[PDB]
């Protein structure tokens, strides 16, 4: 029901484009690419990283109170 000549109504916008054979394959790869992924990462990590830092501190405490109870008892084996 929704094909290309029936989607919206749009006025006064213009598009310019080049052929794929008139373009070189890598305009930039490492001079554009490295600073763009360094700011996409700065925007991410203070939303994503702090929940996984709290799982790490629970894993480290939980696998340290199991070993102190599975018979590491020198002074907890008194008459």
């Amino acid at each position: 029901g929704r094909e290309f000549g029936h989607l919206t109504r749009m006025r006064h916008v213009i598009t310019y484009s080049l052929s794929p054979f008139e373009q070189r394959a890598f305009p930039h790869y490492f001079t554009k690419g490295i600073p763009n992924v360094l700011r996409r990462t700065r925007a991410c990590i203070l939303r994503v990283a702090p929940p996984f830092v709290v799982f790490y501190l629970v894993y480290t405490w939980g696998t340290q109170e199991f070993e102190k109870s599975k018979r590491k008892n020198p002074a907890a084996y008194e008459n």
Partner: protein, 378 residues
């Protein structure tokens, strides 16, 4: 005559895959729908090979699986494709559901509700197949489910002595486990066709949440080449597991044959059932355990009416994104706890994380979206 537009079969292919209008800013999180369809076809063809040499009898079930890995030609590669292809299915399925939850795709109501049905049917299928080899996890996995399935108040004990053939454990026992496991993947296929028929009425969502009818591109060639590339990158990772570490995800205890006499040192399911197992063992009851296991998949169907934000996706909502990855880091906690023994530190951590899974979805998320509406003045 354009024959792509006038032939009765070629019209359907052209409207569904070639001339389909698609958003231009679709990410690679939208790759995992066709990856799920590749993983389903792979499990069907490989499973139809194993079913010509398997024997469903509790005296010769374990011995017919060792025979195909040693005697039948290319039986060892096809068996470990099947076991590792099922882990591949469940990792793509959890990415797929988490995508639709973060971007707000559950607003396609008929597409979301067929999806929650498909999630139950693949979880029940994978349970039946892990009973069929009959080692010491197929035994102590089957009995833990079916004494938990005798705690249904009025028809419970009627249903437990139906699936074993009527007896306790015998030859005719795994004919019913095998016949369910044969049939359910072909119903999953029919439900996935209806799934895409309802999505064809609106087209796709996009990472901004905003409608994109002024910026469509055709599906061919832009997403036919992007989906082929993601499928090749998935067949690479699967074969790294089959050919360089085929026993990494399994357990060694399933290479001992089932014995009601001997004793297994621990009870550990597959990694993708370990989160549900941790919610079970936190409820000291056997009716309230099977209820809270079924309510952890069925809470997905309340996501359309719990939505109180003015915007559709989480791209522009920074407080809802801290709660989304608190929920992912809580399903990692429940996977670790489900593979630990039941002693003191892992018993309070396990039940304080079963509470947090329901407190985030039902209470903390709808209140946080209202605070965000008020800081933007709607």
């Amino acid at each position: 005559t354009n024959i792509r537009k006038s032939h009765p079969l070629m019209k359907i292919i052209n409207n569904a895959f070639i001339d389909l209008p698609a958003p231009s800013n679709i990410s690679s999180w939208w790759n995992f729908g066709s990856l799920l369809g590749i993983c389903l076809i792979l499990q069907i063809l490989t499973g139809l090979f194993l079913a010509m040499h398997y024997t469903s009898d509790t005296t010769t079930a374990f011995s017919s699986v060792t025979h195909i890995c040693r005697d039948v030609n290319y039986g060892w590669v096809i068996r470990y494709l099947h076991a590792n292809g099922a882990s591949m299915f469940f990792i793509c399925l959890f990415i797929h559901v988490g995508r639709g939850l973060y971007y707000g795709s559950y607003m396609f109501l008929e597409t979301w509700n067929i999806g929650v049905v498909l999630l139950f049917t693949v979880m029940a299928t994978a349970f039946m197949g892990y009973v069929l080899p009959w080692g010491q996890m197929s035994f102590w996995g089957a009995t833990v489910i079916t004494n938990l399935l005798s705690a249904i108040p009025y028809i419970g004990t009627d249903l437990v002595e139906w699936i074993w053939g009527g007896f306790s454990v015998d030859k005719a026992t795994l004919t019913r486990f095998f016949a369910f496991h044969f049939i359910l993947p072909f119903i999953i296929t029919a439900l996935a066709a209806v799934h895409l028929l309802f999505l064809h009425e609106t087209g796709s969502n996009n990472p901004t949440g905003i409608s994109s009818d002024m910026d469509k591109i055709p599906f061919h060639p832009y997403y036919t080449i992007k989906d082929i590339l993601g499928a090749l990158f998935m067949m690479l990772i699967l074969l790294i597991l089959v050919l360089f570490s085929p026993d990494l995800l399994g357990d060694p205890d399933n290479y001992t044959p089932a014995n009601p006499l001997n004793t297994p040192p621990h009870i550990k399911p597959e990694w993708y059932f370990l989160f549900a197992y941790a919610i079970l063992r936190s409820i000291p009851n056997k009716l309230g355990g099977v209820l809270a296991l079924v309510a952890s998949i069925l809470i997905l169907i309340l996501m359309p009416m719990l939505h109180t934000s003015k915007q559709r996706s989480m791209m522009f909502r920074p407080l809802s994104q801290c709660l989304f990855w608190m929920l992912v880091a809580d399903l990692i906690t429940l996977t670790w706890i489900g593979g630990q023994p039941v002693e003191h530190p892992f018993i309070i951590i396990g039940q304080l994380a079963s509470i947090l899974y329901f407190l985030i979805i039902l209470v903390l998320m709808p209140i946080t979206s209202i605070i965000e509406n008020n800081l933007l003045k709607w």
